């Protein structure tokens, strides 16, 4: 696909970033290392659900004023083509495949049958979790639902399980056409307190490597690069200085579009023709 | 003195308008109530400047 790593990162890091911040004894292992009153005042301030201060995510360039006290800033960046395939070809299908997705499912008895039923379409089933079914089990797909012989199987009724699948646009033929970019975008925690500055580092790159094993940046923004820059005062004439340290990640992605072939061939047929001379 | 010295003029009071992405931070392009501008005003007010 087209992609756009900034708002990727938006994406996932602003539930990420809530989801430890409410979360006391996390911040509580990731600041391990820091002095012991720069971990106290940190996790008073921004940790827990009665915490009377907020960090923020957004996007440079706004027209508003920002919270300056702790603010994640991301800017996009450089990025450059690196490998191509041979005719462009990054991929074929033969059936129009969507994005890919992880959903929860309980197994029901139908007719003699196990079913998994899944929001969407199944274009393609890659594991049913904990599960390897032998050809006796009869496992079959069909439309969106999974379905799965009862009659050796009848203590798995209710079974509960994960479905990883990923679906289908259409039936249709085509070429994937694309090539692969090398691509950077810069975050900076932006603080007046310079050791929230420094903290805000650390909970990122904890936040980052936690990212790393996601099925978004498996499948696509994959080989993530760290580089970080010097801690300096953003801006210098206020009041006060604001102060961060760049880091930035770099990621490899395909660019590709699917390019639909109407062309199909069903038959040949053969004749004979007699030349005479 | 300054009714005396300056033009008439319409003013307007900026607001931001509440059509902000509210993950982007930037304004909707097609917004009827500011034009693209992330900026939202008032109805006019007459006074002499
Ligand atoms: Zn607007």
């Known amino acids: ?277 | 003195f300054i009714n005396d010295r300056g033009i008439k003029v319409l003013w307007e009071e900026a607001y931001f308008c509440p059509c902000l992405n509210p993950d982007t931070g930037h304004p909707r392009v097609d917004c009827p109530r500011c034009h693209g501008k992330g900026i939202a005003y008032l109805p006019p007010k007459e006074t002499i400047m």
Request: glycine share 6%.
């Open chain 1, 1 to 277: 696909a087209i992609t756009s790593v900034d708002s990727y990162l938006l994406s996932e890091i602003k539930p990420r970033l809530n989801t430890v911040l409410e979360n006391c004894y996390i911040i509580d292992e990731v600041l391990k290392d820091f002095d012991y009153q720069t971990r106290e005042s940190f996790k008073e301030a921004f940790c827990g659900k009665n915490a009377q201060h907020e960090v923020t995510v957004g996007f440079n360039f706004p027209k508003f004023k920002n919270n300056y006290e702790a603010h994640y800033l991301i800017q996009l960046g450089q990025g450059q083509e690196t490998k191509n395939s041979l005719g462009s070809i990054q991929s074929s299908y033969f059936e129009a495949t969507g994005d890919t997705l992880v959903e929860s499912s309980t197994a029901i008895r139908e007719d003699d049958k196990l079913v998994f039923t899944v929001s969407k379409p199944i274009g393609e089933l890659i594991k049913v979790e904990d599960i390897e079914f032998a050809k006796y089990d009869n496992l079959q797909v069909e439309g969106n639902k999974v379905s799965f012989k009862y009659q050796t199987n009848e203590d798995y009724e209710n079974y509960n399980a994960n479905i990883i699948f990923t679906e289908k646009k259409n039936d249709s033929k085509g070429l994937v056409k694309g090539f692969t970019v090398e691509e950077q975008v810069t975050v900076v925690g932006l603080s007046f307190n310079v050791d929230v500055a420094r903290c805000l580092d650390a909970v990122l790159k904890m936040i980052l490597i936690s990212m790393r094993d996601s099925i978004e940046e498996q499948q696509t923004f994959q080989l993530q690069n760290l580089s970080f820059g010097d801690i300096a005062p953003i801006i210098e004439d206020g009041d006060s200085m604001i102060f961060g340290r760049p880091t930035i990640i770099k990621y490899t992605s395909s660019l590709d579009l699917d390019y639909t072939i109407t062309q199909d061939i069903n038959k040949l047929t053969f004749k004979e023709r007699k030349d005479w001379k």
